[PDB]
Write an enzyme that holds these catalytic residues in place. Structure first.
Site, mmCIF file in Angstrom:
data_model
loop_
_atom_site.group_PDB
_atom_site.id
_atom_site.type_symbol
_atom_site.label_atom_id
_atom_site.label_comp_id
_atom_site.label_asym_id
_atom_site.label_seq_id
_atom_site.Cartn_x
_atom_site.Cartn_y
_atom_site.Cartn_z
ATOM 1 N N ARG A 132 0.800 -1.220 0.000
ATOM 2 C CA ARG A 132 0.000 0.000 0.000
ATOM 3 C C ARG A 132 0.835 1.272 0.000
ATOM 4 O O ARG A 132 0.283 2.348 -0.228
ATOM 5 C CB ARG A 132 -0.991 0.008 1.165
ATOM 6 C CG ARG A 132 -1.894 -1.206 1.187
ATOM 7 C CD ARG A 132 -2.968 -1.110 2.245
ATOM 8 N NE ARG A 132 -3.950 -2.178 2.103
ATOM 9 C CZ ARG A 132 -3.921 -3.327 2.767
ATOM 10 N NH1 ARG A 132 -3.002 -3.550 3.693
ATOM 11 N NH2 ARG A 132 -4.860 -4.230 2.555
HETATM 12 N N1 LIG Z 1 -6.911 2.745 -8.840
HETATM 13 C C1 LIG Z 1 -5.739 2.177 -8.503
HETATM 14 N N2 LIG Z 1 -4.633 2.385 -9.228
HETATM 15 C C2 LIG Z 1 -3.466 1.824 -8.893
HETATM 16 N N3 LIG Z 1 -3.300 1.024 -7.834
HETATM 17 C C3 LIG Z 1 -4.331 0.751 -7.018
HETATM 18 C C4 LIG Z 1 -5.639 1.314 -7.323
HETATM 19 N N4 LIG Z 1 -6.488 0.878 -6.388
HETATM 20 C C5 LIG Z 1 -5.775 0.091 -5.552
HETATM 21 N N5 LIG Z 1 -4.498 -0.002 -5.943
HETATM 22 C C6 LIG Z 1 -3.452 -0.765 -5.250
HETATM 23 O O1 LIG Z 1 -4.005 -1.411 -4.110
HETATM 24 C C7 LIG Z 1 -3.400 -0.881 -2.939
HETATM 25 C C8 LIG Z 1 -4.400 -0.852 -1.797
HETATM 26 O O2 LIG Z 1 -5.592 -0.154 -2.113
HETATM 27 P P1 LIG Z 1 -6.109 0.849 -0.983
HETATM 28 O O3 LIG Z 1 -7.378 1.499 -1.433
HETATM 29 O O4 LIG Z 1 -4.951 1.703 -0.558
HETATM 30 O O5 LIG Z 1 -6.438 -0.194 0.185
HETATM 31 P P2 LIG Z 1 -7.939 -0.383 0.707
HETATM 32 O O6 LIG Z 1 -8.684 -0.734 -0.542
HETATM 33 O O7 LIG Z 1 -7.875 -1.511 1.689
HETATM 34 O O8 LIG Z 1 -8.300 0.926 1.346
HETATM 35 C C9 LIG Z 1 -2.867 0.463 -3.361
HETATM 36 O O9 LIG Z 1 -1.739 0.785 -2.557
HETATM 37 C C10 LIG Z 1 -2.362 0.139 -4.736
HETATM 38 O O10 LIG Z 1 -1.155 -0.602 -4.617
#
Ligand SMILES: Nc1ncnc2c1ncn2[C@@H]1O[C@H](COP(=O)(O)OP(=O)(O)O)[C@@H](O)[C@H]1O
Ligand SMILES: Nc1ncnc2c1ncn2[C@@H]1O[C@H](COP(=O)(O)OP(=O)(O)OP(=O)(O)O)[C@@H](O)[C@H]1O
Ligand SMILES: Nc1ncnc2c1ncn2[C@@H]1O[C@H](COP(=O)(O)OP(=O)(O)OP(=O)(O)O)[C@@H](O)[C@H]1O
Ligand SMILES: [Mg+2]
Ligand SMILES: [Mg+2]
Ligand SMILES: [Mg+2]
Lengths: 460, 173, 513, 52, 52, 85, 458
Positions: free
Chosen positions: C376
């Site tokens: 993340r």
């Molecule tokens: N739209 C996106 N573009 C690029 N990477 C993404 C995207 N959505 C999620 N990711 C990847 O998934 C990881 C975790 O998603 P995140 O939203 O930070 O966690 P959660 O969904 O648990 O809140 C991000 O750090 C990234 O690595």
């Protein structure tokens, strides 16, 4: 004077014995010295004679049997109004940003009844997000409730950061951000993001991080609602963002066993639907003012059967489901079109042009999911040439729903894209018909508009 | 152990004894009630599952030194909840609550040899200022402490025994 | 050799000059029961929750249930000698551990007594085992690397200084191997290391320490042990004791890396404690607060801004940001992530690395599943060269596995697909790496450059392993100034791309695999 | 070296056997408040040679 | 090899410290037993009651 | 071993006069309030499913008739109710 | 001095005068009809009540019996006086022979050796058995666990290990029967006496007829004898007939001891009770214990808590599969689940390490193909995929072996296979030297030469 005494401490739950004629009311606050530090307790239950069972708004460490407890004859009251804007507060409404005293003129109890049936409104004015799959498949309206469902690591946070960027900067009105059960790292990065982009003066943040004792996380969401309800009752239009609704229910589960309740279901508290409903039914738009809200919802192990996610689905208006099965392919935003839905997707709002385009896309992706089962064992040659064509144009539409976000460049390394609703509709029609039958599948992936998918094909 | 379930009954009885200015009598009544509770024939009867009222009136039968108007009632309230085995603990809390109400403390002193009256004077006079209560000392001098003294009041303890210093020194290893 | 035999007496005798003739006062109780390491105490009106209670001998218990009319407490050691009617004294104290620089290269139990037999501890005083983490305004964003030395992890799943990264998988999949290689590689990075062993057998901890000492890594490392024989209280506290040692470096402006091996064994010890205390069982029989157990532990791993360091150090250290990085380990029973303890820890952390048995048996070691693993923090943790090269790799490799499934019986591949169905196999082969053989940044970057810029494409797949070995050997003799430049800077430019292109062009012509 | 400290311990016993003499400071000069006359003037060496 | 030798030397000194302290207090106990006095006992009592 | 509505002032009444059945069966007092359930001492003539009137023109349904108390469920807001009502 | 005040199954509560209450793990004694019963103290309750487990049948106990307080734990004979003899959990002689000529008795409850005492060793110990030392070899002084369900072969495998190891090894040995069959105790004892090897072996038996207190503490009686021989400075072999019964006898008493149930109803203390037993079975700088343990797997569920906890304790783990055994391939070792700490290039060296990883890779890929084959049949495979299958099936047969102890079942005579012949055979099969032989040629043959002679007659 202090008039009660601590008679048990087990974990987060403290029992206090008052005189039989001055017993604290339910949800009253209480106060005790935990050494140097002042600690607050919230009354949950009256039981036996004079004894009350309470949750600590802070660590139980260092409490003794015998400490004198002061009875504050009001519930937890938090500062509200403009004084809150640009400030970070804890559950008790104390500043935690070092900037000094909040300087309020009014304070409101965090416990209050929902709007009455006569006060509600149905003003479903369509709202554009700039995200292809959301604006087509699950259109927002002003004053509605939106849920982003998904398990761990699927994109709820960066989707909410994209939605905050697009609407919340454009909104021209105040916003509340409730960091319920959030990671302290991400709450910091959001505060600096809002400061460096210089919109922090519009927004007030309430933070209840994970490390905080179960009492804090149990109540921090109500502090965020109470600030949003103050701005609504002024007659303003406000945005409310909730970091994770699930973590409020989980904090309820932690205390519920110590509060002596018998367990239910998948070990949830018996009151789960009541506790969810009493929070959610305050987040509504009345005739005086509107609250638009986006809530992230954790789905344990991605099982949408689980009682906590399954119960919240009924309270929302648009629901976006983020799936690990898609996320495993890296195709963010990872919104599942066959499960995401909105109350606004019908011809009487969207018009027939948009309605026909969304129902078309659903029918194609549904058909392809059945065809994909044949292919994996038998191979693709066993299809009709029309089913082969649907497998082609579906597998393209699946990629065309992807879009890079300019809050995700750090992950991707690539420039983020915004799309109008008008351009989104035209693009999906074009894949559903012949215009792009000749482009590869990879020519769609994380592109942007259809008008530049041809360009990636030329590059591919 | 009956210590928690004795608490409610112990308090009720004391407040009542205060409003009726009869505390000394009750303490005598509870002592009698606690001795019939120990009788070997009654201890079988109390353990078997008689109905509360058939047990209580059989209990009232074996006491005629009880204030029936107030003391039979107490027994009937405990019988209706099966509590009669708590009577020896209800007694001890009645005595405890009485001493708090009379603002008076028992204190135990232990030493290698008997103290002088002048030492017992200084000990009592200090403890009354420590506690802000009256004190009544008892001395229970001992075979094993070879010098010094221990003072115990409530559960707070002050140690000046050489026994305690020898171990408290060896602890610095 | 031991003329100090005279001088130890003077040390012993002066202790008498320090010892003190005051009578103190203390609150007192008596033990009323003893069972399975739990004691009940009558008295102790002034006992506090989480206080250290002192027992006959030099033994202690922790007060956990403050009920009316009794205290329930857990014994941190062998309990079987305790008896009813033993007299028990409440101190004023919470639990504290020795902490400091002098812990490095020592093996200590959770109470911090040295068990390596290298004599007494040198230390810089004592610190509380239980402590609150730095709040929101006291942190700084994670944007520096901690290098794993593994091609798969450092490219795909980058770990930054102050991140929490879950290593998760079934038994015998390389969970510990990854984490001790991450320790071994810090030997010259300046990042201090802590390894906490919860519930392992003591001869395994012998073997690990013997590998850390076979490299230069042990002199950079603290080892904190609670073996399977030790009481559940000692195991439950062992992660918190390790974090308190890591926080000493974090609050000074130094970096620490802490590995909690088997957080799930910490939860099992916590379940033992809770059921023996008769607290109501929640799901899967764990107590409900078990989330608060892991989440308060892991939020201590943080990067703090320079202002917090200056305040803590009272101006001794200025301008330096300190960081603690945590790598917890969870064992799944059958890949089932839905268990209560795995779902909690997956919720808490900043990512996970999934290791799995099917890849490990296929010979993909390290067995990192690119799809369900994620960081993340991502690219903000990498050096720019790795950031540029690795971003393409992980999502391409995931789609290769989907493509390989869809393809599996189709006779005709279009050349985009046929190219994809080859490139992905050669990248899959490239990311395999032997244990205890960590690669520097420049060495990883060079090998990834060969894959991204297509130079692998003609080389037959089993030779890809020999191709990599020969390329590292060739570049180390002939082109070491560039390796120094990349390792020191992490920089990337057109001349860097040009020099790497020239090296790949020159290697692939002149040498032999 | 192990064979040196194994020898040196045998040498060290005599300093431990000497310095156990000095116990009056431990006992009497803590606990009797004022310094003491040597009532143990034989029992001090009795302790020394019997105990070590 | 030199690190291993110095560490065992440091252990031997802490071992030797464990040996004397036990037998020292066990001797100092006997100094009480053969040097205690009733005026000194009364001196202990009268001191502590004056600072309780 | 745990207490079952054994509370000091109720006990003191029974000490003063055991035959408290002399007071009317029609009425009682709240002795606990939690989660929308109340426990009532008295109401000797309560019956299954009966409406009990509360202050504020509210009602509860009597659902457990127990040997010492009635368990009733509040048909409205409950959070301001208090023991001794 | 004490009085019995409750009897609940195996558990007896005893009241003592409050000045005299027995310590934890003290032995008590009570007259039960015409015999003497020992009780072991588990917990001190309040008020001088103490809670204890009966080392024998508890039927015929009244309340109110007088109980005698022995001032010490359960103590058992140790040393050479125990060699060649069968003993009770209480260390009483169970053979009809005279008293045991003890010189010393040791308490069965002991602390594990300190972290400073432990010793490492990498001396590979050879076995006769092709799959075991190929896939999961083990060292002198290490721990081995045989995991399996009911009837899969745990005991026959341990009987080959006794035959191969414990007769080319020269030192003493201990066999602990824990909750297993009394017939198999008698059968084993007679083959030891018939072979005149009995005089090197100590046998502790607490078989499955015995009440729970016997089954629980007989494991500790067995270790305490092995710890005497280790501390004497010897190299010792310890065989434990079923470790699972130790945990199960804990489950049976735990509810009567008043402990809330955990997980699948196990005792909450399961991991500590197992851990304190297991940590004592360690080789040390003074002397060595080599250990083989059978591990019953209830309902074949390898994810049950009791198997799962045992896996972290051991250095080599061999997993036996009912699905293989029902093929009639024996030993029914699963090579994709069996593993060892010793399968490492540094200790085994590269040729062994590469052969084991090749076998593991081919057999994994055969699992990946079986779901294709199950529906479509094999004809749909690629011509390389067919070659993986054609090799994997040969490999599965060549893992089979005739055991000398199994001759009473198979009839065909037992084989001992060298490590040099095993790695040479599998390396030859994977190189494809033998792709002209049928599958039956490999089944139940000792060495690869024996396969080619079998192939001549098909
Ligand atoms: N739209 C996106 N573009 C690029 N990477 C993404 C995207 N959505 C999620 N990711 C990847 O998934 C990881 C975790 O998603 P995140 O939203 O930070 O966690 P959660 O969904 O648990 O809140 C991000 O750090 C990234 O690595
Ligand atoms: N990169 C690698 N290449 C080859 N073998 C490896 C690699 N990493 C680990 N192994 C081997 O895998 C085996 C298990 O590794 P490790 O002990 O780290 O697994 P684990 O998951 O910690 O096991 P446990 O669950 O018992 O703790 C060891 O034999 C080790 O040598
Ligand atoms: N190598 C072998 N050759 C022939 N038969 C075998 C072999 N291994 C096991 N079997 C058969 O399996 C059956 C049971 O094996 P065994 O008695 O060793 O199982 P077990 O360990 O006793 O299982 P459990 O203890 O659960 O009863 C026996 O009939 C035996 O013939
Ligand atoms: Mg999130
Ligand atoms: Mg491991
Ligand atoms: Mg068997």
């Amino acid at each position: 004077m202090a008039t009660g005494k601590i008679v048990q401490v087990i974990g987060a739950v403290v029992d206090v014995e008052f005189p039989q004629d001055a017993v604290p009311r339910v949800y009253d606050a209480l106060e005790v010295q935990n050494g140097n530090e002042r600690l607050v307790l919230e009354v949950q239950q009256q039981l036996g004679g004079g004894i009350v069972r309470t949750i600590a708004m802070g660590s139980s460490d260092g409490l003794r049997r015998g400490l004198d407890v002061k009875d504050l004859e009001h519930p937890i009251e938090v500062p509200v109004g403009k004084a809150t804007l640009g400030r970070i507060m804890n559950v008790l409404g104390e500043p935690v940003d070092m900037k000094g005293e909040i300087g309020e003129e009014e304070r409101w109890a965090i416990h209050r009844a929902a709007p009455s049936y006569e006060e509600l409104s149905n003003s479903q004015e369509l709202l554009e997000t700039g995200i292809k799959v959301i604006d087509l498949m699950a259109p927002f309206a002003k004053g509605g409730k939106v849920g982003l469902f998904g398990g761990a690591g699927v994109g709820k946070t960066v989707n909410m950061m994209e939605l905050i960027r697009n609407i919340a900067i454009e909104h021209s009105g105040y916003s509340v951000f409730a960091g319920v059960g959030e990671r302290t790292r991400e709450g910091n990065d959001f505060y600096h993001e809002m400061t460096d982009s210089n919109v922090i003066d519009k927004v007030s943040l309430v933070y209840g991080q994970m490390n905080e004792p179960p009492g804090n996380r149990l109540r921090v969401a109500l502090t965020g609602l109470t600030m949003a309800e103050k701005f609504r009752d002024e007659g303003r239009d406000v945005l409310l963002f909730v970091d994770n609704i699930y973590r409020y229910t989980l904090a309820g589960t932690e205390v519920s066993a110590l509060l002596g309740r018998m367990p239910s279901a998948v070990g949830y508290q018996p009151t789960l639907a009541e506790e969810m409903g009493v929070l959610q039914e305050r987040i509504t738009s009345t005739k005086t003012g509107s609250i638009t809200s986006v809530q992230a919802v954790y789905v344990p192990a991605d099982d949408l059967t689980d009682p906590s996610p399954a119960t919240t689905f009924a309270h929302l208006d648009a629901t976006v489901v983020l799936s690990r099965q898609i996320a495993s392919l890296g195709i963010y935003p990872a919104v599942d079109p066959l499960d995401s839905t909105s109350r606004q997707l019908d011809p009487l709002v969207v018009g027939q042009e948009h309605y026909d385009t969304a129902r078309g896309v659903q029918s194609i992706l549904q058909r392809y999911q059945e065809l994909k089962d044949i292919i994996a064992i038998l191979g693709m040659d066993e299809l009709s040439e029309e089913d082969k064509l649907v497998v082609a144009r579906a597998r393209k539409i699946q990629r065309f729903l992807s879009q890079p976000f300019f809050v995700a460049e750090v992950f991707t390394g690539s420039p983020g894209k915004y799309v109008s609703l008008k351009d989104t509709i035209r693009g999906f029609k074009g894949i559903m018909e012949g215009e792009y039958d000749h482009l590869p599948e990879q020519a769609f992936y994380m592109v942007g508009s259809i008008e530049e998918a041809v360009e990636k094909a030329k590059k591919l | 152990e009956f210590i928690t379930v004795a608490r409610p009954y112990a308090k009720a009885a004391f407040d009542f004894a205060v409003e009726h200015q009869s505390v000394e009598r009750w303490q005598d009544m509870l002592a009698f009630a606690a001795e019939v509770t120990k009788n070997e024939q009654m201890a079988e009867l109390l353990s078997g599952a008689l109905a509360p009222e058939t047990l209580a009136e059989s209990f009232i039968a074996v006491a005629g030194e009880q204030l029936d108007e107030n003391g039979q009632n107490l027994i009937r309230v405990m019988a209706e909840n099966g509590r009669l085995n708590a009577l020896p603990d209800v007694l001890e809390q009645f005595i405890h609550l009485r001493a708090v109400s009379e603002a008076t403390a028992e204190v135990d002193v232990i030493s290698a040899a008997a103290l002088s009256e002048q030492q017992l004077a200084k000990i009592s006079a200090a403890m009354e200022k420590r506690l802000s209560r009256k004190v009544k000392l008892n001395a229970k001098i001992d075979k094993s402490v070879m010098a010094g003294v221990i003072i115990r009041a409530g559960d707070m303890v002050i140690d000046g025994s050489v026994r305690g210093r020898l171990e408290r020194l060896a602890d610095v290893l | 050799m031991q003329l100090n035999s005279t001088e130890i007496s003077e040390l012993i005798k002066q202790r008498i000059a320090q010892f003190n003739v005051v009578s103190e006062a203390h609150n007192e109780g008596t033990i009323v029961s003893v069972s399975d390491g739990v004691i009940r105490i009558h008295g102790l009106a002034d006992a506090m929750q989480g206080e250290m209670i002192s027992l006959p001998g030099n033994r202690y218990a922790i007060a956990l249930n403050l009920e009316r009319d009794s205290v329930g407490a857990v014994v941190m050691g062998p309990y079987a000698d305790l008896a009813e009617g033993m007299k028990v004294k409440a101190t004023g104290r919470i639990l504290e551990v020795p902490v400091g620089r002098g812990l490095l290269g020592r093996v200590v139990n959770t109470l911090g007594a040295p068990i390596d037999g290298k004599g007494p501890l040198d230390h810089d005083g004592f610190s509380a085992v239980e402590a609150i983490a730095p709040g929101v305004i006291e942190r700084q964003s994670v944007d520096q690397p901690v290098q794993t030395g593994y091609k798969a992890v450092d490219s795909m799943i980058p770990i930054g200084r102050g991140q929490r990264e879950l290593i998760i998988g079934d038994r015998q999949t390389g969970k510990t191997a990854l984490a001790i290689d991450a320790i071994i590689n810090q030997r010259d990075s300046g990042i201090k290391a802590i390894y906490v062993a919860i519930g392992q057998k003591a001869s395994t901890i012998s073997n690990v320490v013997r590998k850390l000492e076979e490299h230069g890594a042990l002199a950079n490392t603290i080892v904190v042990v609670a073996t399977a024989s030790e009481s559940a209280a000692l195991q439950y506290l062992a992660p918190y004791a390790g974090a308190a040692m890591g926080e000493y470096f974090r609050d000074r402006g130094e970096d620490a890396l802490i590995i909690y091996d088997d957080l799930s064994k910490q939860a099992v010890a916590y379940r033992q404690i809770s059921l023996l205390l008769r607290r109501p069982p929640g799901r899967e029989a764990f107590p409900g607060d078990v989330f608060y157990l892991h989440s308060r532990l892991l939020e201590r791993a943080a990067r703090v801004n320079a202002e917090y360091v200056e305040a803590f150090t009272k101006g001794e250290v200025k301008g330096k940001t300190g960081s603690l990085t945590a790598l917890p380990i969870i064992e799944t029973q059958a890949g089932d992530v839905s268990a209560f303890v795995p779902t909690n820890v997956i919720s808490i952390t900043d990512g996970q690395i999934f290791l799995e048995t099917n890849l490990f048996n296929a010979g993909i070691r390290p067995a990192v599943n690119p799809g369900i693993s994620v960081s993340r923090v991502g690219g903000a943790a990498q050096t720019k060269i790795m950031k540029k090269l690795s971003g393409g790799i992980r999502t391409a490799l995931a789609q290769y596995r989907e493509l390989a499934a869809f393809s599996q019986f189709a006779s005709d591949l279009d050349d985009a697909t046929r190219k994809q169905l080859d490139h992905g196999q050669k990248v899959t082969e490239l990311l395999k790496q032997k244990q205890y053989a960590p690669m520097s940044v420049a060495q990883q970057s060079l090998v990834l450059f060969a894959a991204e810029r297509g130079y692998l494409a003609d080389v037959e797949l089993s030779k890809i392993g020999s191709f990599e070995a020969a390329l590292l050997a060739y570049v180390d003799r002939d082109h070491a100034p560039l390796m120094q430049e990349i390792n020191q800077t992490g920089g990337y430019n057109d001349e860097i791309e040009g020099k790497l292109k020239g090296i790949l062009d020159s290697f692939k012509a002149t040498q032999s695999w | 070296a192990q064979a040196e400290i194994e020898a040196e311990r045998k040498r060290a016993r005599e300093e431990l056997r000497k310095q156990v003499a000095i116990l009056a400071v431990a006992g009497a000069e803590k606990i009797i408040e004022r310094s003491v006359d040597e009532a143990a003037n034989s029992d001090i060496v009795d302790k020394l040679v019997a105990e070590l």
